[PDB]
Write a protein that binds this ligand. Sequence first.
Ligand SMILES: CC(=O)c1sc(CCOP(=O)(O)OP(=O)(O)O)c(C)[n+]1Cc1cnc(C)nc1N
Ligand SMILES: CC(=O)c1sc(CCOP(=O)(O)OP(=O)(O)O)c(C)[n+]1Cc1cnc(C)nc1N
Ligand SMILES: [Mg+2]
Ligand SMILES: [Mg+2]
Ligand code: NA
Lengths: 802, 802
Amino acid sequence: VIGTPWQKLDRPVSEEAIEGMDKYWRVTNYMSIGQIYLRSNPLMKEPFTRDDVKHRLVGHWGTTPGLNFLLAHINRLIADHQQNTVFIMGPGHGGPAGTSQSYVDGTYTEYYPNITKDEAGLQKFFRQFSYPGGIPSHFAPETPGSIHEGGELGYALSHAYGAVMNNPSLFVPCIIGDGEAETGPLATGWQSNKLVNPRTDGIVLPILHLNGYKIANPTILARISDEELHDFFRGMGYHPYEFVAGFDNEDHMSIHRRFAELFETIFDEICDIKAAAQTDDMTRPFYPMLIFRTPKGWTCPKFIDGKKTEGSWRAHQVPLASARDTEEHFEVLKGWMESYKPEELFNADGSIKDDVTAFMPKGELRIGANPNANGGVIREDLKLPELDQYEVTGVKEYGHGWGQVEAPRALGAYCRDIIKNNPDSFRIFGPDETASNRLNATYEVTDKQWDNGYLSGLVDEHMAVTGQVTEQLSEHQCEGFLEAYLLTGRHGIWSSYESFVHVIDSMLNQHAKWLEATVREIPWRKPISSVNLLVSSHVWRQDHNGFSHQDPGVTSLLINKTFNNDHVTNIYFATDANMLLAISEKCFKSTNKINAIFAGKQPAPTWVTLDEARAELEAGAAEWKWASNAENNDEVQVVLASAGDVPTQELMAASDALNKMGIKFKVVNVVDLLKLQSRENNDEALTDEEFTELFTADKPVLFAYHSYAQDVRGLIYDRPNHDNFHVVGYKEQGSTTTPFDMVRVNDMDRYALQAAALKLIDADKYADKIDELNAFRKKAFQFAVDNGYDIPEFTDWVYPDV
Amino acid sequence: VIGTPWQKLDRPVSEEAIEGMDKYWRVTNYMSIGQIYLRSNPLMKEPFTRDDVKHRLVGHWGTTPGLNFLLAHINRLIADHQQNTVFIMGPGHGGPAGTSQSYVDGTYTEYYPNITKDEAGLQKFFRQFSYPGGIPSHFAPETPGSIHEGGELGYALSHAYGAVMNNPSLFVPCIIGDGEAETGPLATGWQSNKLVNPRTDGIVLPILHLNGYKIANPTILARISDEELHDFFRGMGYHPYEFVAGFDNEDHMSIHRRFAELFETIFDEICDIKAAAQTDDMTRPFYPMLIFRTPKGWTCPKFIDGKKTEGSWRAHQVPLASARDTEEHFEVLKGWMESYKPEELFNADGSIKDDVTAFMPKGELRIGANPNANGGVIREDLKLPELDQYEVTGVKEYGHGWGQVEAPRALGAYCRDIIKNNPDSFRIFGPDETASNRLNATYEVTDKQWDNGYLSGLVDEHMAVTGQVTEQLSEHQCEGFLEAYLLTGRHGIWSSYESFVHVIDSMLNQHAKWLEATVREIPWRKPISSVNLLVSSHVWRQDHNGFSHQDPGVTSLLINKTFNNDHVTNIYFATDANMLLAISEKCFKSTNKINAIFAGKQPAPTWVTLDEARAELEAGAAEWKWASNAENNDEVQVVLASAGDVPTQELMAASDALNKMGIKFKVVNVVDLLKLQSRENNDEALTDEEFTELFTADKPVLFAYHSYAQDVRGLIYDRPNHDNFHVVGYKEQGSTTTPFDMVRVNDMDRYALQAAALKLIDADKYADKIDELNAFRKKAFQFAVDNGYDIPEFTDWVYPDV
Ligand SMILES: CC(=O)c1sc(CCOP(=O)(O)OP(=O)(O)O)c(C)[n+]1Cc1cnc(C)nc1N
Ligand SMILES: CC(=O)c1sc(CCOP(=O)(O)OP(=O)(O)O)c(C)[n+]1Cc1cnc(C)nc1N
Ligand SMILES: [Mg+2]
Ligand SMILES: [Mg+2]
Ligand code: NA
């Protein structure tokens, strides 16, 4: 248990705490300006001149003094209440507030011993910000106290609410830009309070950083009427409180006392909600939120060159852009740094004075030290059930290609038992698709968590105010909740229709970037559990939907995060349920990855046993010898290679036909896609020798690929024999139609695969047979048109091993 | 002018109109069930049996009777008020409501003559829905009256509000799923009413289709308290009205009269707002919105197999899934179809009776016929200014590589004058980045349109309640507004930081799919203007930001929509401002495309004259002979090829060094990326002969690519000499740093490009020189570390032609 969660003070904030908060705010403002502007001389010792100013002024001042103000008050609150707290910096371009916070709390020097608490350390701290060989502009994973960089705006609230799930002692004050709140993902993020429970989860306090402006415009929320703004927050289930400061001559000590009093009222309300929830955990409370309305750039010069800067979008990036080049900008910068009176904040040796930090929290309550902001220090491996009990044993009892299994049901049973064994640290998210993607065996041990109105057991099934599945029709919510759940040390999976995974392409990019920086150069940030995404209801079998639901292209995006041997991204094609099981075990053990797990949910053959699945997965691609009819690679006339359940089924049927014609071939299944890249691009891929062994040195290879052929073509560009691969992938064809028709129109069906294999082998010799196969595809299509279902010869085919 | 816009009735809805609306609702419900369930016998003529039921039951009943109800009332409103109207079907899986609407209004038979108004036509209409060789499950572009398919949910409101921009006579009732409203893009879509003007734009009426459920869950909005729901809509600037029906025994005629009365109150309020806006166009009104709360699946069987179906998520997809296989489901289906009393709705010949449609609008007011729902019939070519006046003439006067131009400023001036010449049909959208991406010369002739509070001319600049630029910090808004603006026949452009274009990857996918279906098989849907996206502030020069802002990967997504010779996607690399001008002219003339226009906004050399730009763009890739020093291709030791402003600059400097060493090479610039594909994949690409002429038959080619190397590798897979290309692209390296450092760490800098060219030519011979270049890159990096700016030898280099 960290601290004493949810305790009220029952006395006023002390005057010593007010004095310390004002010094915090002045020293963090001063050092934020130092990080942006100063390459040397951080205490302005004589002579302080333009030569001390950075040659390239980069950074964002506008948000920063508002963040520094809130962080003074959040620090005071954590110390007085001993409250387990992680904050979210929505405007993550306010990096200097976050580095300053860590430098003040002592964690920065603890993690970065060269950046010491004295004048030499402070000089290095100023220079390094946004500087070559230094540190980032944003609140990056290398900053103690960050679980959210806030570079690509919009995810502040999903991360805040995922952090508090199953974390009942955790308080998250979530600072949201008012520009940020105009994004789609942030606007739906407010609604998360219908999906958390005040007893079993922790508490988010949204703080709208309503500074009136984004980059070059006012914000929507800052210019609507007060009555609309309050109605908006009340309508989303909050009790809105509003603070307004900095727009008149009120002295800063008075402002601190008024804010401290308000923040105590708000926290007392949060403690009352927490206490009440021990008895009534079914009534959704109106959680407080805070409208924090202060001038953008607060405390910078009001006008610069006759233009209003404090209280304007003009304060957004770097005021006084000429501070190094003109004595006029320099004199302004000097007056501004001096206005904080650093001679009262730092000792002669350059260390921040003790009376600046006596009010601060200590130990693991510090924002920089709390282990929820470095959740791999809290993370424990899952207690996983034995995989063998889930195996589809039909392959062993009856043969390769047996049965009509819906593959994700086996993952569902495995998930059900993982939740049983790990009942408060493994969650499933879904955008109203958990049952549709066949993971609903989980409901046998838990419910979907819904903290909003109930009506009747005639409609409400498998839903309760607490549970370990969460659904909302938003891929951004599901991805953001899960990411923060992992970042705070827990585990999970989500599932999406494949075409709609693209809604969160950019979130996958940012989380991959977080992982890249971490595996490269942040070894104190310990490994977290991986994002596991079941990519299902795929391009080939969207029976009730049509062409909008046909886009397997998240493969292509994921390929753009496969560099430097970071190994933070995996693309797996689950050939059947036994393979899905073997892939899911590996993913649930893995850390510091995004794992995209492709599996069809339609009834489909099972090809491999679980033991075979375990070996083949490890290799990445495997010959299926029981399906090949060639002696050795020299006898092979063509290599039949597939990735994905549907291409494999069609390839298998084509193999059966090619066997009966007396054609010699081998069958290769590909599960771990990026293991096709060369060793030069991927030090864990198949070696050239293993790659040649599978694909031959010079035989043609027909490769039936689940997604866009482009992906495989680009991955295998420097591989031996790559000029002989003919990759058949999805090619933007299809509609609402029968299963045969969907493969037919992308040349993916068994008949077209058999034809392509014959064309690769000898086009002239097989000219007639190819015509005949192409005519059968027309006949089969006409059959479907006339009759309403596919031709029995297609649907009724079972691999001859069965 | 279509109809008589914004006219009140000032009498009650007639009883004849109520009777006609009830018959509409019954016949469209009946035919919706017919489309889902029936392969033959649409009038249930003796014998009606299981054999008439489809073998594959696919489709979505739950949303559909609510849509059919609203469409009866929207049709009545259009007819009585003669109101120019396009609706948006948010729940686009209710395709049968949209096809039924067109079949009733007569447009379906007008566009599809085989689907006649009689029993034979009705049989074909039922069978074809969601059927092989038939039509889609959703409200697809092939349905008259659609500008929004609603497959990937969330974009209903951005499309509605973009439709009404500069369209002051247009009314858009926008039907939003209540599941849909849990998405991010929909949640921010409500806020658009701060960005439209009630005088110069038309009016959206959001209708929340609050049927209580999504697929397998209730919805957030349906289960919060009524007071929260109303406060929510009032807080977003609406006057909420709520209708509740279908939950008790109220007869359907009574329900129609109550709704008609309410819908007249709402429309009268919209007419009052429109009238008032002729005098006060600065006060933002509270626009009506409608909460429409009815049971999901309304009018289907209340219970099926003991499970509540009407008023449940269970009604979502296909009730009575056994209707063909069991007499029990069949008897239920039969009673349900009979409950609509089709013997009163159709004549003996199977035509829908005249008294079913006497209340309907006629001519171009019909929802299926209105030209705003087929805007290429309204679209006129832009009156474009002459391009030559914008040319950067520095190249002609001083030489190739001259000056420090910020390329998008020339596009800004060109846009400024396009708006001048087309002052109400060309708009610019930006997610608070218009000025940041340097398109702010447009503000010389128009303002950013902002219909929310003003404070002071000290902060409000270039903003007014009407104008042709719109900004909101949401890529989903900018993309959705623009798409509908084009779909209703107008023109525009938007700009985004390149990394954040990924927020709307999935919207680009859907619009590409809309374009694919249209160019393939919908010739009555005439061409619309293209989506033009300035992709700027790119990976190499995000000076104030860092690694979160470094992701040029939208190239890779766009490559997945380049099939079948649809030619609906273009990727252009603007080498400099003259090239950007030549690309922008072509894009502004083009139709039925998405055009991604890559240009850097940093100060940069101009390489080509405008006449050269015009020729090279047409070819797609061009030798720059004035930069090559080889005689012919046989003399070439290496081909120096680049795409993108920054790779080209570095390649050019490498060429200068390689020239001074006595190395023989040619320079090739690539502008129109997909023209590198083979003719087999792209019938408008470079032929093999032209490709060999540029890239040689067998010399090494160093290709410095703006984005991920993977893209170029996969595109050129079947090209002559492709095994000799070495593609250098962005490889997930970089941070907040100097311009040299960002290229350095991706091996993209001039020194590394010169080294790679030497390695390709003779690794042994040049071993020492390569070491030396690699050491200079270290020295240059250390310089930046020590000094705060890049080494003068790097920054000060100008191409020797200047
Ligand atoms: C850094 C960057 O690229 C910023 S900061 C910013 C304004 C944010 O204003 P906000 O009111 O949220 O913050 P504050 O006033 O500074 O506190 C924008 C549009 N951008 C570009 C941008 C665009 N779109 C998205 C999704 N994310 C980002 N970061
Ligand atoms: C068709 C499909 O793939 C549907 S329909 C649906 C429920 C929509 O409920 P809503 O309340 O909006 O509509 P209604 O009750 O039927 O009127 C979902 C989750 N899906 C999957 C889905 C997921 N995510 C996104 C972005 N879009 C879609 N279409
Ligand atoms: Mg702001
Ligand atoms: Mg609904
Ligand atoms: Na090759």
